[PDB]
Design an enzyme around this catalytic site. Structure first.
Site, PDB file in Angstrom:
ATOM      1  N   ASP A 262       0.830  -1.204   0.000  1.00  0.00           N
ATOM      2  CA  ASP A 262       0.000   0.000   0.000  1.00  0.00           C
ATOM      3  C   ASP A 262       0.865   1.256   0.000  1.00  0.00           C
ATOM      4  O   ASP A 262       1.320   1.718   1.056  1.00  0.00           O
ATOM      5  CB  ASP A 262      -0.947  -0.020   1.218  1.00  0.00           C
ATOM      6  CG  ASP A 262      -2.015   1.042   1.152  1.00  0.00           C
ATOM      7  OD1 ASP A 262      -1.922   1.916   0.261  1.00  0.00           O
ATOM      8  OD2 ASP A 262      -2.961   0.986   1.965  1.00  0.00           O
ATOM      9  N   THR A 263       1.060   1.831  -1.191  1.00  0.00           N
ATOM     10  CA  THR A 263       1.803   3.077  -1.314  1.00  0.00           C
ATOM     11  C   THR A 263       1.082   4.264  -0.674  1.00  0.00           C
ATOM     12  O   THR A 263       1.709   5.309  -0.436  1.00  0.00           O
ATOM     13  CB  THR A 263       2.074   3.376  -2.792  1.00  0.00           C
ATOM     14  OG1 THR A 263       0.833   3.544  -3.493  1.00  0.00           O
ATOM     15  CG2 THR A 263       2.860   2.260  -3.413  1.00  0.00           C
ATOM     16  N   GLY A 264      -0.215   4.146  -0.414  1.00  0.00           N
ATOM     17  CA  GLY A 264      -0.956   5.197   0.249  1.00  0.00           C
ATOM     18  C   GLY A 264      -0.878   5.187   1.759  1.00  0.00           C
ATOM     19  O   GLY A 264      -1.470   6.043   2.414  1.00  0.00           O
TER      20      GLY A 264
HETATM   21  C1  LIG Z   1     -13.556  -6.430   4.385  1.00  0.00           C
HETATM   22  C2  LIG Z   1     -13.075  -5.183   3.579  1.00  0.00           C
HETATM   23  O1  LIG Z   1     -12.804  -4.144   4.475  1.00  0.00           O
HETATM   24  P1  LIG Z   1     -13.413  -2.605   4.205  1.00  0.00           P
HETATM   25  O2  LIG Z   1     -14.102  -2.523   2.938  1.00  0.00           O
HETATM   26  C3  LIG Z   1     -11.973  -1.444   4.189  1.00  0.00           C
HETATM   27  O3  LIG Z   1     -10.882  -2.193   3.744  1.00  0.00           O
HETATM   28  C4  LIG Z   1      -9.697  -1.420   3.494  1.00  0.00           C
HETATM   29  C5  LIG Z   1      -9.276  -0.328   4.491  1.00  0.00           C
HETATM   30  C6  LIG Z   1      -8.028   0.487   4.226  1.00  0.00           C
HETATM   31  C7  LIG Z   1      -7.183   0.218   2.980  1.00  0.00           C
HETATM   32  C8  LIG Z   1      -5.918   1.059   2.722  1.00  0.00           C
HETATM   33  C9  LIG Z   1      -6.372   2.471   2.337  1.00  0.00           C
HETATM   34  N1  LIG Z   1      -7.294   2.340   1.210  1.00  0.00           N
HETATM   35  C10 LIG Z   1      -8.620   2.916   1.134  1.00  0.00           C
HETATM   36  O4  LIG Z   1      -9.104   3.553   2.024  1.00  0.00           O
HETATM   37  O5  LIG Z   1      -9.309   2.702  -0.090  1.00  0.00           O
HETATM   38  C11 LIG Z   1     -10.753   3.137  -0.167  1.00  0.00           C
HETATM   39  C12 LIG Z   1     -10.907   3.753  -1.295  1.00  0.00           C
HETATM   40  O6  LIG Z   1     -10.943   2.528  -2.381  1.00  0.00           O
HETATM   41  C13 LIG Z   1     -11.556   1.539  -1.797  1.00  0.00           C
HETATM   42  O7  LIG Z   1     -10.707   0.208  -1.877  1.00  0.00           O
HETATM   43  C14 LIG Z   1     -10.188   0.014  -0.673  1.00  0.00           C
HETATM   44  C15 LIG Z   1     -11.139   0.811   0.363  1.00  0.00           C
HETATM   45  C16 LIG Z   1     -11.645   1.878  -0.292  1.00  0.00           C
HETATM   46  C17 LIG Z   1      -5.210   3.324   1.849  1.00  0.00           C
HETATM   47  O8  LIG Z   1      -4.522   2.636   0.877  1.00  0.00           O
HETATM   48  C18 LIG Z   1      -4.261   3.659   3.026  1.00  0.00           C
HETATM   49  N2  LIG Z   1      -4.911   4.638   3.920  1.00  0.00           N
HETATM   50  C19 LIG Z   1      -4.407   6.048   3.957  1.00  0.00           C
HETATM   51  C20 LIG Z   1      -5.049   6.939   2.812  1.00  0.00           C
HETATM   52  C21 LIG Z   1      -6.583   7.011   2.998  1.00  0.00           C
HETATM   53  C22 LIG Z   1      -4.446   8.347   2.897  1.00  0.00           C
HETATM   54  S1  LIG Z   1      -5.448   4.012   5.437  1.00  0.00           S
HETATM   55  O9  LIG Z   1      -5.827   2.597   5.362  1.00  0.00           O
HETATM   56  O10 LIG Z   1      -6.606   4.733   5.954  1.00  0.00           O
HETATM   57  C23 LIG Z   1      -3.985   4.195   6.523  1.00  0.00           C
HETATM   58  C24 LIG Z   1      -3.852   5.423   7.384  1.00  0.00           C
HETATM   59  C25 LIG Z   1      -2.616   5.566   8.291  1.00  0.00           C
HETATM   60  C26 LIG Z   1      -1.567   4.468   8.282  1.00  0.00           C
HETATM   61  C27 LIG Z   1      -0.307   4.629   9.207  1.00  0.00           C
HETATM   62  C28 LIG Z   1      -0.742   5.169  10.536  1.00  0.00           C
HETATM   63  O11 LIG Z   1       0.533   5.517   8.563  1.00  0.00           O
HETATM   64  C29 LIG Z   1      -1.704   3.228   7.411  1.00  0.00           C
HETATM   65  C30 LIG Z   1      -2.931   3.079   6.509  1.00  0.00           C
HETATM   66  C31 LIG Z   1      -7.592  -0.873   2.002  1.00  0.00           C
HETATM   67  C32 LIG Z   1      -8.862  -1.685   2.256  1.00  0.00           C
HETATM   68  O12 LIG Z   1     -14.434  -2.234   5.459  1.00  0.00           O
HETATM   69  C33 LIG Z   1     -14.996  -0.962   5.521  1.00  0.00           C
HETATM   70  C34 LIG Z   1     -15.328  -0.629   6.994  1.00  0.00           C
END
Ligand SMILES: CCOP(=O)(COc1ccc(C[C@H](NC(=O)O[C@H]2CO[C@H]3OCC[C@H]32)[C@H](O)CN(CC(C)C)S(=O)(=O)c2ccc([C@H](C)O)cc2)cc1)OCC
EC number: 3.4.23.16
Lengths: 99, 99
Positions: free
Chosen positions: B25-27
């Site tokens: 996860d690059t994000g």
């Molecule tokens: C059973 C399935 O579970 P689910 O659907 C959710 O699952 C997922 C939850 C999170 C992710 C990873 C997350 N991606 C998404 O948010 O993507 C959204 C949009 O596109 C859709 O696809 C996937 C979901 C939707 C980001 O890559 C990374 N983030 C930061 C970004 C936002 C700046 S972070 O995670 O917030 C975070 C914050 C701080 C840190 C440390 C502290 O630095 C680490 C990670 C992938 C899947 O349940 C819902 C309740």
């Protein structure tokens, strides 16, 4: 280009004729942008993240230029903490992970 | 290797002597893993993204192996819906974005 990950992979995007900064996010299935005005029709949708679900506005077949590469696809608009470019558009610009 | 983004970039990791599937996860600035009772000291932390914040436990200097590439750094443990390999470890395995 090749983008290392020592810093957040932030790039300039152009959407609806306006420039913004967005994060290339391989962990995102979809593209979610902060609240903004976009032309055309839209449908309400829900999306879930690390902390739960949010209401977004779904805009389909939207022109978006990411770091000089054109894409046309779905853009979600809502209270995301950060503009994130998800895999739906990263695939369009030919982005891959390499190590 | 090269990982395309048609599907989620899921890989096998080894941590605390266990094998798991995790998202490259690059994000994500940091790495967030499903609940697991790792030994050693830790400190509480709040991390946020789409949908709000969750409580996690921060462990430092944890060894993870990602597709056979070893990395050592901070891992956050808590009720995350998916195992997330963040930039703090992706950099250590030489991971880049390319388009
Ligand atoms: C059973 C399935 O579970 P689910 O659907 C959710 O699952 C997922 C939850 C999170 C992710 C990873 C997350 N991606 C998404 O948010 O993507 C959204 C949009 O596109 C859709 O696809 C996937 C979901 C939707 C980001 O890559 C990374 N983030 C930061 C970004 C936002 C700046 S972070 O995670 O917030 C975070 C914050 C701080 C840190 C440390 C502290 O630095 C680490 C990670 C992938 C899947 O349940 C819902 C309740």
């Amino acid at each position: 280009p090749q983008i290392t990950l020592w810093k957040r992979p932030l790039v300039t995007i152009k959407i609806g004729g306006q420039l913004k900064e967005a994060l290339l996010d391989t962990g995102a299935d979809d593209t979610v942008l902060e609240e903004m005005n976009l032309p055309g029709r839209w449908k309400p949708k829900m999306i879930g993240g690390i902390g739960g679900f949010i209401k977004v506005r779904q805009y389909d077949q939207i022109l978006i230029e990411i770091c000089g590469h054109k894409a046309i696809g779905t853009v979600l608009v809502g209270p995301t903490p950060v503009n994130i470019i998800g895999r739906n558009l990263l695939t369009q610009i030919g982005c891959t992970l390499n190590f």
